[PDB]
């Protein structure tokens, strides 16, 4: 809250999850999946006691998914469905969530980098015409991550549910020519896990079963460390088989899949994506920077996003980077490798770094009038008010 | 009767032909395609790697890799395949019966020429070979002996000032900024509209969009306002699967990186300042002839509006009393090959070859003494 009583809300609006709260807070006040469901009848499910409205949104639309057809309003960071997104935002600022009068509040929104501009333009238009907010700012995600960590230099590897992006920043100066954006994240990993499980005889073909497979990938799956050793474990031993109880009651068994579904981040060719993994992409991003910044970029690799919470992802990333550095910088001199100093900063609450950075930035800039895009500027200019941020649109 | 082969092998496009012709016999992209699926219809023409045109016609299922990046051959196994396809499949002539005149960019590592010679003498077993600077052949073909050549190929852009046939090697400038960087920058700026091209087989679609639609604006800060005010500058393109894209502002922001490399995150000056500095590095006496004989060459200079903008720049940069004339013929897409065919056919050149006997006496280290 600023000196005018106008609450300063911070809303992350992720492809796979909304994390909303107030400025200066230390934890997101509400974290709920971003999906909108509509009631349907199914010949295999029977419920007759829980009141199901004609439109469930967010948390209740996920816990009650057995009796709904759910769909995400976002995808790859690009809003595919605008009506469902407006419903999700009505629910976010509604009574059974953050309860605010949007006529007298400021909001801090985010957006991935290298995203179509019509998306941000329409989001600002919606925020100024539908909810009629008194102030809107659209910050960069890596900048917010470096705000939350408390740094001014580092290469943010932000891998959310919808999209992975690597953004380096040096001494506070953004290098926008090194921003890389790989389109593999939690959702593609979930789809790959669905494929692998279908190889075992389980069929998850409905809209609700996607959340079941998501909750499986979150509990069981993990990123391997020495993929040859993990394959030897999966092919020779039987210590990787683990059982999971679906909501209906069925018991499925997940084995080698545990380390094959999240491997599609380091070996994209498994899911028919022609490129390089997140480790090789990080190394190429670094080695594309000037010589005088590489040595500091190697020491401040900041992980963020939920999809980097796989057990053993920091260590595997570090091992991959060390191998790449040994082969392609030292050209094979093992003696010098012990001098190479990486530091993959994986904070414990790295699943909400963007929100914490937004909270810090809003707590800093709540009481200014040259930072926020004011509603009057919108009514006067239109979608040109975005030029305040540094993104030039006419 | 033996006639030399003129084989360019620049980045992006390889152009080969016989010495004494007016046009290259065979032009094809210098790519090598590795199949990225495992096909089981065995016996239907399966291969391990498709070279040249055969890769493009299959680029959907291939990973295309350029063996030459920024003028430097980063993969020699692939370059041997390119040369073998040029010799035995495009020209259809044994290499052991003709001399070969290859071309190279200035200020490349000496290992490049060393390995070029070693390969041309130990693998293809040619009786003689030579290696020429491209911007010199681009002046040979123009019918001149005094001028500054501004050769902008797919992967490298270099300027060479020559006067009366005496090159000034202390003013040769190079700039690693060319079609391949403009094509990777268009791939980035296209995302502002919503179009996402990422596969190496879609870099070709983006290169086609760039070489069919993009142009160089005479005034960037004015054409931006023009493209902002009205939709009278948009153009539509039809992808090979049906979808249609439309690009109005990207058209001149793609080649504008040539004149403001900061768009790509590069400190270096644009191509106009690269040419102007290379002129002002010479002597005070020959600068007037270098000004009025500014030659252009290479595919990247095949942009509608490149000559007008280059003249407007180098005229606002040169003294007010110097006349600037941008020599830009429509046959400049292959001026280097014409210069090579002119040079290889001359009689006074028949002593400048590097003979197989010479290579047997001093190894690959000879190409540094003979070849300028």
């Amino acid at each position: 809250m600023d000196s005018q009583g106008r609450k300063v809300v911070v809303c992350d609006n992720g492809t796979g999850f909304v994390k909303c709260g107030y400025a200066g807070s230390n934890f997101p006040e509400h974290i709920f999946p971003a999906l909108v469901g509509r009631p349907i009848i199914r010949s295999t499910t029977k419920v007759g006691n829980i009141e199901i409205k004609d439109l469930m949104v967010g948390d209740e639309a996920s816990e009650l998914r057995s009796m709904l057809e759910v769909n995400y309003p976002m995808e790859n960071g690009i809003v595919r469905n605008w009506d469902d997104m407006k419903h999700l935002w009505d629910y976010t600022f509604g009574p059974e969530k953050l309860n605010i009068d949007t006529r007298n509040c400021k909001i801090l929104l985010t957006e991935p980098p290298m995203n179509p501009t019509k998306n941000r333009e329409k989001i600002v238009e919606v925020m100024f015409e539908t909810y009629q907010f008194s102030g809107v700012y659209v910050a960069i995600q890596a900048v917010l991550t470096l705000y939350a960590q408390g740094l001014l230099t580092g290469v943010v590897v932000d891998s959310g549910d919808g999209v992975t992006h690597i953004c380096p920043v040096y001494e506070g100066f953004s290098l926008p020519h090194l921003t890389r954006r790989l389109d593999i994240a939690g959702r593609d990993i979930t789809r790959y896990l669905i494929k692998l499980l279908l190889l075992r005889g389980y069929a998850f073909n409905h809209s609700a079963d996607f959340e079941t497979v998501r909750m499986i990938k979150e509990k069981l799956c993990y990123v391997g460390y020495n993929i040859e050793q993990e394959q030897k474990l999966a092919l020779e031993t039987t210590v990787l088989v683990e059982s999971y109880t679906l909501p209906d009651g069925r018991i499925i068994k997940v084995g080698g899949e545990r380390f094959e579904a999240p491997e599609a981040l380091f070996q994209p060719h498994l899911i028919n994506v022609e490129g390089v993994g997140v480790a090789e992409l990080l190394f190429n991003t670094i080695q594309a920077a000037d010589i005088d910044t590489r040595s500091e970029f190697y020491k401040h690799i900041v992980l963020s996003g939920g999809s980097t919470m796989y057990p053993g992802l920091p260590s595997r990333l570090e091992r991959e980077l060390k191998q790449l550095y040994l082969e392609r910088v030292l050209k094979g001199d093992v003696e010098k490798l012990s001098k190479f100093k990486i530091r993959i900063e994986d904070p414990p609450r790295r699943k909400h770094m963007v929100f914490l950075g937004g909270a810090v930035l809003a707590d800093i800039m709540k009481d200014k009038d040259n930072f926020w895009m004011t509603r009057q500027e919108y009514q006067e200019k239109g979608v040109r008010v975005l030029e305040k941020l540094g993104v030039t649109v006419r | 009767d033996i006639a030399a082969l003129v084989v360019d092998n620049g980045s992006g496009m390889c152009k080969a032909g016989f010495a004494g012709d007016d046009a290259p016999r065979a032009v094809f992209p210098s790519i090598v395609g590795r199949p990225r699926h495992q096909g089981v219809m065995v016996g239907m023409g399966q291969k391990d790697s498709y070279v040249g045109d055969e890769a493009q016609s299959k680029r959907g299922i291939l990973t295309l890799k350029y063996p030459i990046e920024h003028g430097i051959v980063t993969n020699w196994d692939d370059m041997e395949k390119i040369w073998h396809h040029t010799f035995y499949n495009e020209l259809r002539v044994a290499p052991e019966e003709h001399p070969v005149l290859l071309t190279e960019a200035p200020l490349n590592p000496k290992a490049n020429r060393e390995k070029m010679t070693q390969i041309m003498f130990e693998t293809f077993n040619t009786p003689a070979m030579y290696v020429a600077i491209q911007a010199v052949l681009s002046l040979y073909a123009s019918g001149r002996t005094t001028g500054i050549v501004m050769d902008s190929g797919d992967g490298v852009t270099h300027t060479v000032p020559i006067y009366e046939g005496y090159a000034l090697p202390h003013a040769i400038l190079r700039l690693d900024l060319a079609g391949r960087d403009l094509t990777d920058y268009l791939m980035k700026i296209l995302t502002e509209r919503g179009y996402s091209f990422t596969t190496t087989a879609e870099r070709e679609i983006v290169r086609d969009i760039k070489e069919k639609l993009c142009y160089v604006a005479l005034d960037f800060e004015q054409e931006m306002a023009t493209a902002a005010s009205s939709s009278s500058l948009e153009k539509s393109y039809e992808l090979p699967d049906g979808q249609v894209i439309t690009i109005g502002n990207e058209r001149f922001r793609c080649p504008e990186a040539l004149f403001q490399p900061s768009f790509l995150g590069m400190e270096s000056c644009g191509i106009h300042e690269t040419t102007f500095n290379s002129i002002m590095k010479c002597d005070v006496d020959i600068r007037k002839d270098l000004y009025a004989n500014t030659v252009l060459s290479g595919g990247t200079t095949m942009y509608p509006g490149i000559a007008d903008r280059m003249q407007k720049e180098i005229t606002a940069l040169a003294p007010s009393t110097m006349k600037i004339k941008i020599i830009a013929p429509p046959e400049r897409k292959y001026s280097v090959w014409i210069g090579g065919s002119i040079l290889a056919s001359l009689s006074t050149f028949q002593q400048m070859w590097i003979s197989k006997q010479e290579y047997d006496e001093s190894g690959p280290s000879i190409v540094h003494r003979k070849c300028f």
């Binding site: - | 919503g194 179009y195 894209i245």
Partner: peptide, 7 residues
Amino acid sequence: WXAXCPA
């Protein structure tokens, strides 16, 4: 997205 990829 509009062209390339879905979003």
